[PDB]
Amino acid sequence: DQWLQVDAEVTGIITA
Amino acid sequence: DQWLQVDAEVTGIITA
Amino acid sequence: DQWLQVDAEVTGIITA
Amino acid sequence: DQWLQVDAEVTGIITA
Amino acid sequence: DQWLQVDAEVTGIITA
Amino acid sequence: DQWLQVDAEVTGIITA
Amino acid sequence: DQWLQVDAEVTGIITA
Amino acid sequence: DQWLQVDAEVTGIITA
Amino acid sequence: DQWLQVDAEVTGIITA
Amino acid sequence: DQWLQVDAEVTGIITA
Amino acid sequence: DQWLQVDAEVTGIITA
Amino acid sequence: DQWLQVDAEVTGIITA
Ligand SMILES: [Ca+2]
Ligand SMILES: [Ca+2]
Ligand SMILES: [Ca+2]
Ligand SMILES: [Ca+2]
Ligand SMILES: [Ca+2]
Ligand SMILES: [Ca+2]
Ligand SMILES: [Ca+2]
Ligand SMILES: [Ca+2]
């Protein structure tokens, strides 16, 4: 899976 | 329902 | 939403 | 709240 | 399943 | 437990 | 953690 | 992830 | 319900 | 328990 | 909180 | 997704 970091803005992404 | 956008501060609200 | 207070009897209600 | 009956098609709605 | 009604005392039971 | 297959109609049941 | 027994009144507390 | 649309028949699939 | 104890092997069962 | 306030930065902590 | 590691035997504990 | 079989040791993995 991808995890999207949300703070709103998207501040990151992980990769699954 | 109302959704309150929380960022902490409240940065929005939706209206249900 | 309405919240119904349950104790059984209903002992209250909130109002959403 | 509204409940939407989903079967896809929407086959109903309840009203809260 | 059995459902036990809890109020604490047990005030009921359902029968599954 | 019994599982009731819901599609609305009931289209099946499993038996627990 | 503390568990508070709620019946409404608070009827107990456990201590975690 | 793949999402399989279930209606029973499988009526779709999404791709993650 | 039956609870099956899983450790993999099945190491027990409870019976509901 | 301690609650850590996350905003990312840690912006607080509660104490349980 | 304490976390108890369960494997059945208890094989550990963390401490909160 | 990958599923990791945990028993502690990792005793397997599935792949999604
Ligand atoms: Ca996934
Ligand atoms: Ca609602
Ligand atoms: Ca922020
Ligand atoms: Ca059951
Ligand atoms: Ca259908
Ligand atoms: Ca009572
Ligand atoms: Ca084991
Ligand atoms: Ca806790």
Three-state SS string over H1-16 comes to CCEEEECCCEEEEECC
For this entry, resolution in Å reads 1.3
CA torsion J13-J15-K5-K11 (nearest 10°) is 120
Distance from CA of D7 to the nearest CA of H (A): 7
End-to-end Cα, chain J, rounded Å:
4
Ligand nearest to the CA of F7: 5
Instruction: State in Å: Cα B1 to ligand 6 middle.
Output: 29
The CA-to-CA distance between both ends of chain D, in Å, stands at 4
Residue I11: name the closest of K6, F16, L4 by CA: K6
Residue D2 Cα, gap to closest chain F Cα (Å): 18
Contact (Cβ atoms closer than 8 angstroms) between residue I1 and residue F16: yes
Test H11 with D8 for CB contact under 8 angstroms.
Answer: yes
Pair K14, K6: CB distance under 8 Å? no
DSSP calls for chain C: -PEEEE---EEEEE--
Q: How was this structure determined?
A: X-ray
All chains having 3 or more CB pairs closer than 8 angstroms to chain C: B, D, E, G
Compute, in angstroms, the gap from residue H8 CA to the centroid of ligand 5: 7
DSSP annotation string for J1-16: -PEEEE---EEEEE--
| Residue D2 and residue D13 in contact, taking contact as beta carbons nearer than 8 Å | yes
Give CA–CA dist J9/I15, Å, rounded.
Answer: 49
Handedness of CA I7, I11, I13, I14 (dihedral sign): negative
Give CA–CA dist B12/G6, Å, rounded.
Answer: 34
Per-residue DSSP letter, G5:
E
Chain B: list its partners (3+ Cβ pairs within 8 Å).
A, C, D, J
Ordered alpha helix ranges (H), G1-16: none
Q: Are B1 and B14 in contact (CB under 8 A)?
A: no
Locus of tokens 């059945």: K8
- How many helices and strands (H and E) does chain G possess? 0, 2
